[PDB]
């Protein structure tokens, strides 16, 4: 193998740090042997060099035999040189998504051969790669070597190799603008819209150009055929898809089977529209053993099946036409479950996906819908360099009402309503000012931090009154109780006055779902009322019947 004529990268050790001096464990003759064979070869090839005992650095070597075979393997444990090596720039910070790929006439995959070894190593660093093949026991000073090229398993090899291959290609890319070259790890992905004529030829100019550089790729015939089985995906000429998802029929489900499942399912979601994983995931909560058997909940079984259905056939995605636009459609699946599909030409999807997240402790569909829009927007920038025009199941007038009166800033890029149910709405609104001839409930809540004993109640202005005793509460929970009380006994239109900024805040937000069951009943209530006015006042300030509910709920509690 060729060892690249190219320039080298300056490599430094971390500051105030010195090369490794780890002692070589003593080996069996078979391994000392093995290693000797292996090493002389690497030296024959230029890959390593023989040093003396003047160079004090040491990194432990080890030979491992075979699974089936009788071949030996050199293993160098660069854990210390690694712990002393500087940090490098992050290799590649994200991986191409198939759907971001522009359709090309022909694409050829060139896998560099023996990459790491095909590239020099900064001469002045070499000394740190020192290793020793021990002699038979202690007797006899070992054989010392040091790398000339990038050693496998060392911190910078991935980085440097990457750089080198960027520098090597620079030229070619100049005098070859229309050819696309994806660089990934030690692979080269090449495509052009030439007729197989100049393509099959341009491929060779590259290989030759790569060869002037020490880089040996395979020739044709030994060049892979499409569909490329790359990275979890199946890359065909005019479509792409995930690699065969095989959903296991089983008698009992262990934590681990369920996990592997959710995994396969989630990966399937990139192109298999409408995959759900909520019920399945739910089972995972609390986690017993890895080997523990979970019993499929009924919803769980129903999910699993809706899934098998979607997968019971095959879906593939198209590639990217930078001229056409991007459309993104989102649909409400279930409980904080969203599904989206991106396409340029109606119904020929580039990719799909889902959004579930619980952003907050209580939330609603308008707040979730925009969270998904954000998640999709970014995702588009990443893949395509631009954002999609959106078609959301929310009415333009609902959006605007919500957007307008909300405390926090929000902004959805271009969009259009699309009557594809369930539709997004607000299940209740609070009055802006007091209902006339409606009862004023002055609610309250207390809870003794010592006994965690609580008292929830109200005192209305039609002289009505109530108080309840709660047992393992907090003030937040008593104050939410008081309001539920007032909701419970008040009918079609109320006026509620609290001193809980917390309950105020919670409710003013129009939640429609909540992590609290208390917040959920209240929601259920507010949804029933015809008119609800809710206002706040400072507490422990002789205000209205505020003090009146105070003595009520404080009596015993505080």
Ligand X SMILES: N#Cc1cc(Cl)cc(Oc2cc(OCc3n[nH]c4nc(N)ccc34)ccc2Cl)c1
CB of 2 to another protein, least distance (A): 21
Is 219 marked as binding a ligand?
Answer: no
Binding residues among 72-111 for ligand X as defined by CB under 6 A: 96, 101-104, 107, 109
Binding segment for another protein among 27-35, 132-140, 286-294, 500-508 (CB under 8 A)? Answer: 500-508
> Is position 163 an interface residue for another protein (rule: CB under 8 A)?
yes
From the list ligand X, another protein, none, partner contacted by residue 104 (C-beta under 5 to 8 A by kind): ligand X
Q: How far is CA 385 from CA 231, 322, 461, in A?
A: 22, 10, 61
Binding residues among 114-143 for ligand X as defined by CB under 6 A: none
CB of 159 to another protein, least distance (A): 4
- CA angle in degrees (0–180, nearest 5) for 383-389-390: 105
> Is position 371 an interface residue for another protein (rule: CB under 8 A)?
yes
From the list another protein, ligand X, none, partner contacted by residue 404 (C-beta under 5 to 8 A by kind): another protein
> Is position 350 an interface residue for ligand X (rule: CB under 6 A)?
no
CB of 112 to another protein, least distance (A): 15
Binding residues among 184-203 for ligand X as defined by CB under 6 A: 189-191
Residue of the chain from 70, 335, 404, 419 that contacts another protein (CB under 8 A): 404
Binding residues among 373-402 for another protein as defined by CB under 8 A: 374-375, 377-378, 381-387
From the list ligand X, another protein, none, partner contacted by residue 166 (C-beta under 5 to 8 A by kind): another protein
72, 38 in Cβ contact below 8 A? yes
Nearer to another protein, 11 or 112 (CB): 11
> Is position 495 an interface residue for another protein (rule: CB under 8 A)?
yes
Q: Give phi and psi for 64, each to the nearest 5.
A: -120, 135
Is 238 marked as binding a ligand?
Answer: no
Q: Give phi and psi for 336, each to the nearest 5.
A: 65, 35
CB of 244 to another protein, least distance (A): 24
379, 358 in Cβ contact below 8 A? no
> Is position 319 an interface residue for ligand X (rule: CB under 6 A)?
yes
353, 377 in Cβ contact below 8 A? no
DSSP-derived letter for residue 272 is S
Structure tokens at 380: 């588009």
Binding residues among 62-101 for another protein as defined by CB under 8 A: 86-89, 92-97, 100-101
Binding residues among 1-20 for another protein as defined by CB under 8 A: 9-12
Nearer to ligand X, 183 or 287 (CB): 183
Question: 3-state secondary structure string, 230-257?
Answer: CCCEEECCCCEEECCCCCCCCCCEEHHH
Question: Three-state SS for 464?
Answer: coil
User: Nearest 10 degrees: CA dihedral of 409, 414, 416, 417?
Assistant: -20
CB of 391 to another protein, least distance (A): 19
Is 325 marked as binding a ligand?
Answer: no
423, 394 in Cβ contact below 8 A? yes
Q: Give phi and psi for 378, each to the nearest 5.
A: -45, -55
Q: Give phi and psi for 354, each to the nearest 5.
A: -140, 155
Structure tokens at 325: 């636009």
- Nearest Cα neighbor of 264 from 250, 275, 273, 253 is 275
Is 371 marked as binding a ligand?
Answer: no
Nearer to ligand X, 105 or 558 (CB): 105
Sheet-wide strand order for 187-192: 106-111, 187-192, 180-184
CB of 176 to ligand X, least distance (A): 13
DSSP-derived letter for residue 451 is T
Residue of the chain from 408, 419, 450, 471 that contacts another protein (CB under 8 A): 408
Residues in contact with 48: Cβ distance below 8 Å, sequence separation at least 6, in sequence order: 39, 42, 145, 146, 147, 148
> Is position 505 an interface residue for another protein (rule: CB under 8 A)?
yes
Residue numbers belonging to the annotated binding site? 111, 186-187, 444, 479, 499, 550
Question: Which residues bind to ligand X, rule: CB under 6 A?
Answer: 96, 101-104, 107, 109, 180, 182, 189-191, 226, 228, 230, 235-237, 319
Binding-site residue positions for Mg(2+):
111, 186-187, 444, 479, 499, 550
């Amino acid at each position: 193998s060729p060892i690249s004529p190219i320039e080298t990268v300056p490599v430094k050790l971390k500051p105030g740090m010195d090369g490794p001096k780890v002692k070589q464990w003593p080996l069996t003759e078979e391994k000392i042997k093995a290693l000797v064979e292996i090493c002389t070869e690497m030296e024959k090839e230029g890959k390593i060099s023989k040093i003396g005992p003047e160079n004090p650095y040491n990194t432990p070597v080890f030979a491992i035999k075979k699974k089936d075979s009788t071949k030996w393997r050199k293993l160098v444990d660069f854990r210390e040189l690694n712990k002393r090596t500087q940090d490098f720039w992050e290799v590649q910070l994200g991986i191409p998504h198939p759907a971001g790929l522009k359709k090309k006439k022909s694409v050829t995959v060139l896998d560099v051969g023996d990459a790491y070894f095909s590239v020099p190593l900064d001469e002045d660093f070499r000394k740190y790669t020192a290793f020793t093949i021990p002699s038979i026991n202690n007797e006899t000073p070992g054989i010392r070597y040091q790398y000339n090229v990038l050693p496998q398993g060392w911190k910078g090899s991935p980085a440097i190799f990457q750089s080198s291959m960027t520098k090597i290609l620079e030229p070619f890319r100049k005098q070859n603008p229309d050819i696309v070259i994806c660089q990934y790890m030690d692979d080269l992905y090449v495509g052009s819209d030439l007729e197989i004529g100049q393509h099959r030829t341009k491929i060779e100019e590259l290989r030759q150009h790569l060869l002037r550089w020490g880089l040996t790729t395979p020739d044709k015939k030994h060049q892979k055929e499409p569909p490329f089985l790359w990275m979890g995906y199946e890359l065909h000429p005019d479509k792409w898809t995930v690699q065969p998802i095989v959903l296991p029929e089983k008698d009992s489900w262990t934590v681990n089977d369920i996990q592997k499942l959710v995994g396969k399912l989630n990966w399937a979601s990139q192109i298999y529209p409408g995959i759900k994983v909520r019920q399945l995931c739910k089972l995972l909560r609390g986690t017993k053993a890895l080997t523990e058997v979970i019993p499929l909940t009924e919803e769980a079984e129903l999910e699993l099946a809706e899934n098998r259905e979607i997968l019971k056939e095959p879906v593939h995605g198209v590639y990217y036409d930078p001229s056409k636009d991007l459309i993104a459609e989102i649909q409400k699946q279930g409980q904080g479950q969203w599904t989206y599909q991106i396409y340029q030409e109606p119904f020929k999807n580039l990719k799909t996906g889902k959004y579930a997240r619980m952003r907050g402790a209580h939330t609603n569909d308008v707040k979730q819908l925009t969270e998904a829009v954000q998640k999709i927007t970014t995702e588009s920038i990443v893949i395509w360099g631009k954002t999609p025009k959106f078609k959301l199941p929310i009415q333009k007038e609902t959006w605007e009402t919500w957007w307008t009166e909300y405390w926090q800033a929000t902004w959805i890029p271009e969009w259009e309503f699309v009557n594809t149910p369930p539709l997004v709405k607000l299940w209740y609104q609070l009055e802006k000012e007091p209902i006339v001839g409606a009862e004023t409930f002055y609610v309250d809540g207390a809870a003794n931090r010592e006994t965690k004993l609580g008292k929830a109640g109200y005192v209305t202005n039609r002289g009505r009154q109530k108080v309840v005793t709660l047992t393992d509460t907090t003030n937040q929970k008593t104050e939410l109780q008081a309001i539920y009380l007032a909701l419970q006994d008040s009918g079609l239109e109320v006026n509620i006055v609290t001193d809980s900024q917390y309950a105020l805040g919670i409710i003013q937000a129009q939640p429609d779902q909540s992590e609290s069951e208390l917040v959920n009943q209240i929601i259920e209530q507010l949804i029933k009322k015809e008119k609800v006015y809710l206002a706040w006042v400072p507490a422990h300030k002789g205000i209205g019947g505020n003090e009146q509910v105070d003595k009520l709920v404080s009596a015993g509690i505080r």
